[PDB]
Amino acid sequence: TNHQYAVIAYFYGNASLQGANATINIWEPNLKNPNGDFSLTQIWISAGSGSSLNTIEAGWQVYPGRTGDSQPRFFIYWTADGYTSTGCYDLTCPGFVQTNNYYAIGMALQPSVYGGQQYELNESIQRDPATGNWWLYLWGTVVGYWPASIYNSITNGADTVEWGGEIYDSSGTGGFHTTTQMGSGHFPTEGYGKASYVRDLQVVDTYGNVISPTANSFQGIAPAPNCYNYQFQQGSSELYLFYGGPGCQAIAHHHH
Numbered sequence: 516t517n518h519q520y521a522v523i524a525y526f527y528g529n530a531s532l533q534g535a536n537a538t539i540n541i542w543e544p545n546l547k548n549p550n551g552d553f554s555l556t557q558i559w560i561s562a563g564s565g566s567s568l569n570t571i572e573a574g575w576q577v578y579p580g581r582t583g584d585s586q587p588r589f590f591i592y593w594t595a596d597g598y599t600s601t602g603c604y605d606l607t608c609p610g611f612v613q614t615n616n617y618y619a620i621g622m623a624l625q626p627s628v629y630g631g632q633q634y635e636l637n638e639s640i641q642r643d644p645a646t647g648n649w650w651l652y653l654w655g656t657v658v659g660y661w662p663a664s665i666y667n668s669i670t671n672g673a674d675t676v677e678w679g680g681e682i683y684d685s686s687g688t689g690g691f692h693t694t695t696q697m698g699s700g701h702f703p704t705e706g707y708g709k710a711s712y713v714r715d716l717q718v719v720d721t722y723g724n725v726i727s728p729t730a731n732s733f734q735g736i737a738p739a740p741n742c743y744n745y746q747f748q749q750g751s752s753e754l755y756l757f758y759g760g761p762g763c764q765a766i767a768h769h770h771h
């Protein structure tokens with residue numbers, strides 16, 4: 516694959532989670548190859564596996580080939596068969612039902628300032644137990660829902676939630692030698708105001724309580740750690756996932 520990640524994953528014993536939150540620091544990462552590159556930060560809420568993988572996805576993405584510019588834009592995605600034949604971005608296919616247009620799916624977002632003003636995308640996803648519909652709220656305002664009727668394995672709840680950053684490297688370096696940025700383009704050790712974060716790492720358990728997992732409850736993923744990485748910063752108030760990085764320069768020079 517030509518995707519790279521700095522992602523954490525929360526796995527539950529069964530598909531009974533009832534929702535999750537994500538409050539995602541907004542940035543405008545730079546793409547080295549805008550013809551096909553993209554960079555994003557999102558939540559993935561899933562059940563099943565293989566061709567029965569169902570996902571619920573919301574975040575921000577810089578993807579010029581899809582959106583027509585390099586601004587961070589709010590996006591959604593879903594699939595009901597592990598990305599084989601079903602699912603699509605935003606409202607480009609029948610799927611998500613938007614009930615409130617106060618916020619536009621695809622809207623450009625305000626990017627944070629290095630060492631300055633920070634902006635957050637707060638999204639809350641909540642399963643309605645009477646229907647199986649999954650409702651989306653942004654900054655506390657309803658947008659709409661993913662209907663249970665498009666799904667097969669996530670209608671009763673989810674078994675996995677993932678948060679963090681992703682880049683797609685269209686130049687074929689495997690995401691290992693591209694200066695396409697993830698998050699703010701800065702490594703997590705730079706911390707608040709300089710490296711991007713996800714907070715409100717919360718799930719809704721089977722008993723309906725809101726639970727903020729501790730850091731040891733997460734499986735981390737960073738397959739190109741010299742290029743993009745994550746670091747937990749567990750404060751007293753809440754757990755922070757700091758994530759991203761500048762990418763790696765094409766500095767290799769090997770010869771026999």
Ligand SMILES: *[C@@H]1O[C@H](CO)[C@@H](O[C@@H]2O[C@H](CO)[C@@H](O[C@@H]3O[C@H](CO)[C@@H](O)[C@H](O)[C@@H]3O)[C@H](O)[C@H]2NC(C)=O)[C@H](O)[C@H]1NC(C)=O
Pocket residue numbers: 534535536537538637638639640641652655715717719723724725
């Ligand atoms: C983090 O996730 C939790 C869990 O989904 C969010 O709390 C939930 O927020 C929704 C809508 O903001 C609450 O819905 C309201 O509930 C009352 C009944 O008490 C109902 O009459 C209202 O019409 C409305 O639908 C819901 O109660 C609440 N759930 C729980 C378990 O607390 C929370 O908003 C998320 N926070 C962030 C920052 O994303």
Ligand SMILES: *[C@@H]1O[C@H](CO[C@@H]2O[C@@H](C)[C@@H](O)[C@@H](O)[C@@H]2O)[C@@H](O)[C@H](O)[C@H]1NC(C)=O
Pocket residue numbers: 526527528529530531721
């Ligand atoms: C799903 O499983 C629940 C209990 O599962 C275990 O306990 C919770 C607290 C987590 O630690 C989880 O990872 C474990 O597998 C049951 O109480 C619940 O009824 C189950 N739901 C269904 C629909 O069967």
Ligand SMILES: [Cl-]
Pocket residue numbers: 563564565568
């Ligand atoms: Cl899978």
Ligand SMILES: [Cl-]
Pocket residue numbers: 702703704744746
């Ligand atoms: Cl680091």
